[PDB]
Write a protein that binds this ligand. Sequence first.
Ligand SMILES: O=c1[nH]c(=O)c2nn[nH]c2[nH]1
Ligand SMILES: O=c1[nH]c(=O)c2nn[nH]c2[nH]1
Ligand SMILES: O=c1[nH]c(=O)c2nn[nH]c2[nH]1
Ligand SMILES: O=c1[nH]c(=O)c2nn[nH]c2[nH]1
Ligand code: NA
Ligand code: NA
Ligand code: NA
Ligand code: NA
Ligand SMILES: [Xe]
Ligand SMILES: [Xe]
Ligand SMILES: [Xe]
Ligand SMILES: [Xe]
Lengths: 295, 295, 295, 295
Amino acid sequence: SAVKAARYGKDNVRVYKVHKDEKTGVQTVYEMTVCVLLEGEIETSYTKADNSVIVATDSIKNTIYITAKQNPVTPPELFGSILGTHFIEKYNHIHAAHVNIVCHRWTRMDIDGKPHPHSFIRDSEEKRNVQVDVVEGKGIDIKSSLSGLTVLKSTNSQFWGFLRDEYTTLKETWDRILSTDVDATWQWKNFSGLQEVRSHVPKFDATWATAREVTLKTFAEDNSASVQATMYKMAEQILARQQLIETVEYSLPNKHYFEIDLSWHKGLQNTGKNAEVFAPQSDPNGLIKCTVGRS
Amino acid sequence: SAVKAARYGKDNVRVYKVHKDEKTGVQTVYEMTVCVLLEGEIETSYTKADNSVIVATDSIKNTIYITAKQNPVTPPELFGSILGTHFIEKYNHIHAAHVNIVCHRWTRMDIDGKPHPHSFIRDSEEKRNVQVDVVEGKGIDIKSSLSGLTVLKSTNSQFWGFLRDEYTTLKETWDRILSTDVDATWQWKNFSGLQEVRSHVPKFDATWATAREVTLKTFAEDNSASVQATMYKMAEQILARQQLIETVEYSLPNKHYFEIDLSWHKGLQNTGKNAEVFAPQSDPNGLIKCTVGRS
Amino acid sequence: SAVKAARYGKDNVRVYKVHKDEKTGVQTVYEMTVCVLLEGEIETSYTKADNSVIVATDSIKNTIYITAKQNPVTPPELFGSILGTHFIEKYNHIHAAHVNIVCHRWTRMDIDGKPHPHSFIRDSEEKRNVQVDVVEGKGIDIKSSLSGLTVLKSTNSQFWGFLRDEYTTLKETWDRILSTDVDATWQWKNFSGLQEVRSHVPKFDATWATAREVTLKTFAEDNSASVQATMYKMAEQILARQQLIETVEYSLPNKHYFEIDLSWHKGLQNTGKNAEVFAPQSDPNGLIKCTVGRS
Amino acid sequence: SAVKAARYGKDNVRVYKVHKDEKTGVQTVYEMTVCVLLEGEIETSYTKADNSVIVATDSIKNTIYITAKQNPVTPPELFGSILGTHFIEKYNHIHAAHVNIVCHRWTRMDIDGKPHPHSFIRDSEEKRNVQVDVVEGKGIDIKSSLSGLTVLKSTNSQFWGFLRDEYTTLKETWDRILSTDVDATWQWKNFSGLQEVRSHVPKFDATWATAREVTLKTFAEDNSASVQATMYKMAEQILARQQLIETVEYSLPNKHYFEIDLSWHKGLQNTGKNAEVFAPQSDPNGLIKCTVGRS
Ligand SMILES: O=c1[nH]c(=O)c2nn[nH]c2[nH]1
Ligand SMILES: O=c1[nH]c(=O)c2nn[nH]c2[nH]1
Ligand SMILES: O=c1[nH]c(=O)c2nn[nH]c2[nH]1
Ligand SMILES: O=c1[nH]c(=O)c2nn[nH]c2[nH]1
Ligand code: NA
Ligand code: NA
Ligand code: NA
Ligand code: NA
Ligand SMILES: [Xe]
Ligand SMILES: [Xe]
Ligand SMILES: [Xe]
Ligand SMILES: [Xe]
């Protein structure tokens, strides 16, 4: 037998950082969960019990805190790239670092219509994420994403004209509820190294904002022919607005809300045009994915 | 042996309702999870296998949908009272109904600075809840609550002057992070029945809004001496603003964020005045409760 | 306003303890999650920012570890009583301690038909729990429980003869699946203090074992007329076997498995006597409770 | 823009099947959660709102139930292969089916030392899983796995001789707790189609059993030099016992249990040789992976 692939590191490292403006007294907080996995010439730790090649996972944890202390942690694309680069430069035998960062929302509170200097609220479990793969001699590959954005529209969704055969019971519809949890990922062109990532820093927050805005607007405004058709429209627009993105991927559950026939009870009318009360279904759910790139 | 207490019913009933304004085209959605448990002269179903006394839990589920179809589902205090009253009036041998409702957020989307007619976002997992106990001959008792409101302030929290003995290692502090998930419950004076609940309908949404606002403002503005002192200030204000509330209860976890000493690494300074990077602790957590009533 | 009730302490304190037999080399592990909440003359910490009355929650955490170091942690009824008693004896102004303990399963592995001296498996998320309330001048009240015991029987469950009215759609049945997650609690007679709890130590593990065995046997063997009837039979037997128990409470979800009519597809027969494939329902679920005591 | 990749289908489809032996009266239950995603000539549903190419996800759900009705559901490798093959044979324009199956434990109860004919217990949340990719013209690729197997050993684990530099604080150790949740995957040689999968049916359950047994025995018996070294030993043995496996992958969290220094309290000794009480850490955790194949 032989080691075909191996990676190891530290997962679920929670980090908080505060920035304090001495002049204005305004404080800004960042909270993330970080995972770092390393690859390189480490096979002997598996095959020969040779621990000399192992950078202890506890040391990786220390490194994350030290790096957060000495560098900005925003945008996460930059922080991930700094953190990944550290390991390949510091350790001769480590040749790849894989950094995943989940950013948690701490939104500044408005008290009496004014932004509070040091108080924050978690407005939703929506996350902004990055995956950064730093590979020695092959640059920095960055995938940025948003996830956990949960939306619903109560009309202006249709689904008709699908394949009908002996397995089909679903009725065609011209008016249904559409609800999903959005997972959207945009993959950046490969970067040669940290200097190049630094040169593009302003694009990271702007592109996240654009992806979010396009997702929300398209969902709200499209008279949707299917999840497939609506998600394609989203991806198309993102690619049009940021030339440094190579591909956009969406993964969307179709969270079903079923009509409830109440006609058995005193002829009560609750279907089609008369539908007011619905039963949200926890499972099963449709799952629709697509990756869109450039012609 | 004898049956000392018994209750049964249906839990986790998900319900969605849409309201459509024909004039404006604006649609408004409500989504809830409902639990109904009944008590009464049902001992024989346990002791003698006498099912004749059982209103099937499946029928309770049907009743929830039918009641939602025929009545407003907001404010939840009113809907819960209608639903509970139904069971005690309909069934001679049922003498109490216990209704719990969790309301999920579907917040209208703003697209290009304008409210969208039929598109919604789940902005946070904060819930608005009610517990309604309808007891034949004893009226309607309603406890309203908010939960899952997660907040953090990065300064203006202190904790010093506590008891110190041979079990104590905690250092006094004049500047710490304070973060909690707020669970706040206000208990209404007993209502004689549905007519009285209906007469107070406007107070329910207003009091929820007031409780939320007082919680957020007090948290943001108090230079907190402890969780205990800050939560008391919140409860005091709520009681002052709504005379129909008898008691307010808060239950607050103290979600700890620990300093990280980095001095072992090149004398790096990250504690006290120099603290910038912290380690959020998932467990254990302080838990602080109090119930405040009128003198 | 006035403080009507108040309690505070530390939740989610994870503890592991190992016992090492020097003679045999056999090691035995215990893992628990502990919560301790205190009450007493602590109102001024809420109303006057007087922290002098507060035993810091961090100190409570320390106390749990120290107490686990110096005392046996099994049976949990004894450990909880020692821990609770400590606070009321140590602190003049603390008059009640509320201790909740959840015990996690670490079951000794059998390797080649032999018990391994120091290796363990988590066989299921079933828990053994205790709630101990130590109240100065009123002794020690202990509620013991098991929870998270998930079972299913594929036949020998019926449900017919229930109330039928205009809200009822459920068909009577003489053969259905019955599945539940068992939560069972037995409440001990009040104990005067630690000496009395110590005197009954052997009864705690034996009664837990009896409760588990009676639950499993009755579920497996009863030709069940309803959840209500079967659970009553369980509680009856437990009370008969341990005179020091005052009441037994069961809380049982009815986790539904629905027939799937496949007759629309080539006349395929999958209902009633021909039912083979079913759809487990995640929600809603029946919830049935009862508390049984002595005549 | 262009569609680079696309797949869609139904997730979280819960299925239960019962088998009834008419002769012995013994019943056996199977419960699974199934996901099916399809690929093929479906781009136009995304780009042109052409639903004619879409096999509705609701129809996929129906197909899963119908297939379970007409075929054995065990071993899951066979069921997944039948289900996947169905879609590529039935639909001209569908060229790949991806089937994931999670099997839930329903273990027959022993009542009074005898196996009960129709009563079952969920002994642990350990799962047996399969991933089956059926690709037209490229056969059937099957990855089998077990997951959620949680184990702990209280001694006979060491970790010393790792890299030490200015980022390192971890002390070397010759005696520590080792605990993990095992995720192990074995990848089968490619199969040409259903006939070949059928020909190997007995190997599927046997190999699962072997993987489980080797994992447990090696964990219990290895005087572990690291997670890396122990997991390699496991994978090596599995590959040696089943020639039809091409690779074995393990992914193991290192769930840390920390010593608690209690010396500040009356010189209490709780570290090194005297360590009895430990603090399980919920996060962060080491994560160690490796894929082992044949020389
Ligand atoms: O078994 C281990 N492997 C590792 O890579 C490691 N790093 N810290 N502790 C550890 N333990
Ligand atoms: O056992 C049952 N008890 C009940 O109260 C009930 N209601 N519907 N189905 C049921 N099954
Ligand atoms: O606000 C606090 N209240 C408390 O009771 C406490 N105990 N430790 N830290 C604390 N902080
Ligand atoms: O938008 C949809 N896309 C689909 O593929 C589908 N299948 N059933 N319902 C559906 N809705
Ligand atoms: Na390198
Ligand atoms: Na009545
Ligand atoms: Na006392
Ligand atoms: Na095909
Ligand atoms: Xe969508
Ligand atoms: Xe607070
Ligand atoms: Xe039961
Ligand atoms: Xe391991």
